[PDB]
Design a protein around this nucleic acid. Structure first.
Lengths: 379, 379
RNA sequence: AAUCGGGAUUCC
RNA sequence: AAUCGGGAUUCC
């Protein structure tokens, strides 16, 4: 059998793996793919290549690309690779490429998707360091939050009807059980929340303010203003209408992002900054100042909701001849990709939000901390 | 089938797991054991217990204890659990216990074992921040290192005979390949090393200075002097004679430690401090001052060499009646445990040292850093 | 991606 | 045990 270069389109669930890039001994998506290539009979041995995107730990992807030389001679090869692969990783197709094709260089654009529970937009709890800081803004009258005021007031109403004035604001048998029941009560109060139209409008205003070509040095752990890479371009960004899904009936929103290229954890930093602005009520224009002088520390959002929709290859497509090599279009798989998304990615995100408590953790930590200086009605 | 409380003795390889304690969704030794209990038919469902030691991520254990109620009615049950378990986790035996038995409380003592490559004792490289600091000690004449002087001089001799004055002390095709070949040369020079008797004597002197009852606040990430837990007692500690094992013919030493109880990463902090004292040549008595006033930051050693030999249960053994319940003695399995050690733990440590480059990483990082103030011939 | 020094949260 | 703010190393 001869060697033949080829490109493999793949989809996977990022949960339970240490990223896309091969990095032993920790199990990675590439490691599992390689293990499935020798079980189907397309790889030789020893060692060896490129990839469209290097998705971080836990990040899923409806679409990703690898490029390698394999024995593409068996008519039923992709079926064998899929039978030798776990249910959470699928190979959509195997299309041939040329020697000039570079997976990292010829990546024109990228489509990402972030699932976000709507209760992430509720303001901080009374008694938190961020609330008292926003309260300390009672000098310069900023924004006022009447929505989260009624939410936390209703939670305090429910707590006094379920507890009997237990000073359970202290921890380190039944007191453990009391505090756990209290935390479960807060989590259920968050999961019962239904977002308004004004909060969604503010969130979409910030997301729209992300659009265009800007310096994104404050949305990455990297060099500052006078760096080349910091300038990047967002082509499209859309926050979907909220929807309720799951047994717990949590409410979610889907943020679809279209970009040229991306920095380290740029998407998560952007989504976190948007949620932080929407939460306290800081002026939406304060996001533009994040492009400005003073460097700020914004923590990136949980990687659980991050999902790489698809990489685009406009440059390689146009430069392709009329006959001989097919174009790289991910829209030609939308049926199987949508089914796999719904089954293995989306449902896993819902279950892991309900159990692993990722998004509750993230914002219970934001209130106890650097980034407060930006959203403190003064910077 | 009725419920029956029991204690399971277990052994495992820590590589590829996130610790002993059950912590989903990350795969743990307890998670794999539970998955193997329902595949053999000893657990019901839903959820649920104690454990002798909570071994950190990557740490292996020739012996560990769990306690749970299971259906111990099938005569060939342990064989089924072992057939339903990966090769890297074994159940040695399943002996019954009483309701009073507490795995964490009645743990009398613990035997740990650390495998350490001898090249960890070689002093810092010329041009490192720690060398120049030890060089800055050319005022107060401390210790002088003639052993590592000839080692690094011989490496510089070999580099000039293999390279042609390439200023490859700069990085960020072939220059990458040049630097990689240079680093492989340094690693091979370390692996060819054979420890002397004086260095081993100094290492054993420090290890012996660990013995007795002392305040170990500087050997844990925790509270300082005026804390209760900091006082702990070491009963026995022995560094074995060096031995050469493996295809790469690396030289190792085995440090066996016997203690009452242990703090967070106490063993690794102790081993790292011993190696740090032996390396630069700081006075062995400086380890005693680590029990003293000034708090110091000592980084814990790689968890790869750490191996929990066995927990002891002297209190539960003596308080046991003459008939009815068997004593918890781990020495009754030494054959199978030694075979499993040699095959799955020790060989894995050797392979992971050669490949994953753990111990080379650790000490190449010590030279570039807080802890230098202790071993700088002045504190 | 992994390790380590500290600071913080969630599950333990 | 996991996440995050920075500082450092190893493999990339």
């Amino acid at each position: 059998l001869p060697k033949r270069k080829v490109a493999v389109m793949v989809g996977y669930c990022g949960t339970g793996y240490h990223g896309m890039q091969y990095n032993p001994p920790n199990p990675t998506i590439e490691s599992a793919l390689f293990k499935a290539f020798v079980e189907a009979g397309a790889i030789s041995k020893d060692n060896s290549f490129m990839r469209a995107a290097r998705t971080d730990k836990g990040v899923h992807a409806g679409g990703n690309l690898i490029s390698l030389k394999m024995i593409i001679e068996d008519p039923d090869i992709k079926q064998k690779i899929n039978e030798k692969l776990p249910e959470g990783i699928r190979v959509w197709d195997i299309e041939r490429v040329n020697k000039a094709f570079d997976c990292r260089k010829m990546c024109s654009s990228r489509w990402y998707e972030y699932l976000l529970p709507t209760y992430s937009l509720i303001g901080p709890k009374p008694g938190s360091i961020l609330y008292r800081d926003i309260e300390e803004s009672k000098t310069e009258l900023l924004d006022e939050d009447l929505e989260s005021k009624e939410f936390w007031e209703e939670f305090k109403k429910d707590a006094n009807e379920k507890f009997s004035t237990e000073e359970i604001e202290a921890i380190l048998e039944e007191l453990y059980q009391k505090v756990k029941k209290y935390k479960q009560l807060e989590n259920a109060h968050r999961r019962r929340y239904r977002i308004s139209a004004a909060k969604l409008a503010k969130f979409r205003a910030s997301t729209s303010q992300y659009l265009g070509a800007h310096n994104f040095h404050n949305f990455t752990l990297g060099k500052d203003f006078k760096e080349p890479s910091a300038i990047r371009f967002m082509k499209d960004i859309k926050v979907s209408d909220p929807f309720v899904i799951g047994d717990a009936q949590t409410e979610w929103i889907s943020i679809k992002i279209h970009g040229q290229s991306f920095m380290l954890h740029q998407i998560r930093k952007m989504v976190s900054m948007a949620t932080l602005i929407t939460r306290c009520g800081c002026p939406v224009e304060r996001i533009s100042q994040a492009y400005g002088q003073q460097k700020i520390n914004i923590p990136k959002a949980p990687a659980l909701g991050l999902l790489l929709e698809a990489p685009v290859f406009e440059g390689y497509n146009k430069r392709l001849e009329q006959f001989g090599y097919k174009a790289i279009d991910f829209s030609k798989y939308q049926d199987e990709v949508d089914k796999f998304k719904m089954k293995h990615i989306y449902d896993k995100i819902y279950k892991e939000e309900v159990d692993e408590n990722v998004f509750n953790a993230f914002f219970s930590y934001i209130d106890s901390f650097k980034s407060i200086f930006e959203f403190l009605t003064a910077k």
